Amino acid sequence: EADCGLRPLFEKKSLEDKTERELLESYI
Amino acid sequence: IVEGSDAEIGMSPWQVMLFRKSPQELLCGASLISDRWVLTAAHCLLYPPWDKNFTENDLLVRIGKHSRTRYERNIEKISMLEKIYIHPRYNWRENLDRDIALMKLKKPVAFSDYIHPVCLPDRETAASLLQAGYKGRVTGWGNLKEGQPSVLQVVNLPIVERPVCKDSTRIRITDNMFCAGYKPDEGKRGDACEGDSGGPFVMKSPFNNRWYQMGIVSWGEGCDRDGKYGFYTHVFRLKKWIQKVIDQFG
Amino acid sequence: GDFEEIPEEYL
Numbered sequence: 001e002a003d004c005g006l007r008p009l010f011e012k013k014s015l016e017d018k019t020e021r022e023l024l025e026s027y028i
Numbered sequence: 029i030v031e032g033s034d035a036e037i038g039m040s041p042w043q044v045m046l047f048r049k050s051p052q053e054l055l056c057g058a059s060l061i062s063d064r065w066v067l068t069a070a071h072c073l074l075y076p077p078w079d080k081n082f083t084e085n086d087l088l089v090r091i092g093k094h095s096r097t098r099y100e101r102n103i104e105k106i107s108m109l110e111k112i113y114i115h116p117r118y119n120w121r122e123n124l125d126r127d128i129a130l131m132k133l134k135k136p137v138a139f140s141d142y143i144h145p146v147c148l149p150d151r152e153t154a155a156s157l158l159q160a161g162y163k164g165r166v167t168g169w170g171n172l173k174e175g176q177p178s179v180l181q182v183v184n185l186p187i188v189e190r191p192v193c194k195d196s197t198r199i200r201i202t203d204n205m206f207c208a209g210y211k212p213d214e215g216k217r218g219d220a221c222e223g224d225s226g227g228p229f230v231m232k233s234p235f236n237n238r239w240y241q242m243g244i245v246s247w248g249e250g251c252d253r254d255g256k257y258g259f260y261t262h263v264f265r266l267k268k269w270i271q272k273v274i275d276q277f278g
Numbered sequence: 279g280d281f282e283e284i285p286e287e288y289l
């Protein structure tokens with residue numbers, strides 16, 4: 001939907017999961 | 029998944045379990061891409077060399093799960109397949125080229141804290157994110173090595189340069205596939221395995237902070253073997269087929 | 279198998 005890819009328990013609440021920062025750091 | 033870790037609750041609410049009715053058992057992974065559509069690997073449903081050819085009524089879709097074996101009362105939803113759609117040029121005879129399939133559900137699933145669809149990329153997201161070295165995430169209830177886990181497993185893996193992918197196998201690799209995994213030199217390891225089939229490879233866009241499914245778990249020789257990589261169906265490359273199907277049979 | 283029974287209704 002228009003809401004695809006936004007997780008209710010993380011992005012919707014502005015919480016990050018324990019390893020998503022590993023992905024971001026690789027997006028150089 | 030080999031060398032991964034327990035998922036957090038609600039970390040992959042697009043994660044779907046393909047479950048056989050009799051005998052009751054995990055079949056494959058899969059993913060929720062709308063309230064009525066599930067994406068998975070063609071090989072999960074059709075693979076004549078192993079006499080595999082499931083029909084709609086042999087299967088159930090289990091959504092919102094965390095536990096592998098438990099029936100997660102008041103959390104998971106279990107849905108009936110209306111119709112299966114396999115890529116007409118899915119190459120099961122040779123190399124699993126175009127290893128993709130869609131499943132239409134009988135009725136729409138209710139979104140929740142634990143149930144939510146993932147996005148499919150557009151060309152610019154694919155172009156920006158599918159670069160050697162960038163990491164994606166793979167999840168699944170498959171084997172822990174070449175036991176079974178108690179709950180959903182997760183592992184982050186780097187996309188690998190196509191020539192390195194090519195030089196790792198005798199199989200003929202195609203533009204509809206990409207490979208991912210650590211090189212033997214990059215001390216860390218991890219991989220998808222039997223049972224993870226059909227599950228999503230996802231990346232979180234740094235541009236809109238949405239998760240996109242870039243790949244589907246397709247194949248690999250052994251699991252987590254040094255100098256071998258996991259291979260994934262290139263979702264963006266097959267997206268025209270995905271839209272067509274959804275547009276036509278709604 | 280090692281799988282908990284799902285409600286009959288789904289089967």
Ligand SMILES: N=C(N)c1ccc(CNC(=O)[C@@H]2CCCN2C(=O)CCc2ccccc2)cc1
Nearest residue numbers: 071122123124220221222246247248250251258
């Ligand atoms: N290490 C991984 N990442 C991994 C390993 C296994 C799987 C499950 N996929 C499968 O087992 C697929 C089904 C057809 C044969 N197969 C294989 O992976 C065996 C290798 C092969 C690839 C392509 C055509 C023929 C043979 C999925 C992922």
Ligand code: NA
Nearest residue numbers: 194195197198
């Ligand atoms: Na080769």
Ligand code: NA
Nearest residue numbers: 252253254256
């Ligand atoms: Na490897």
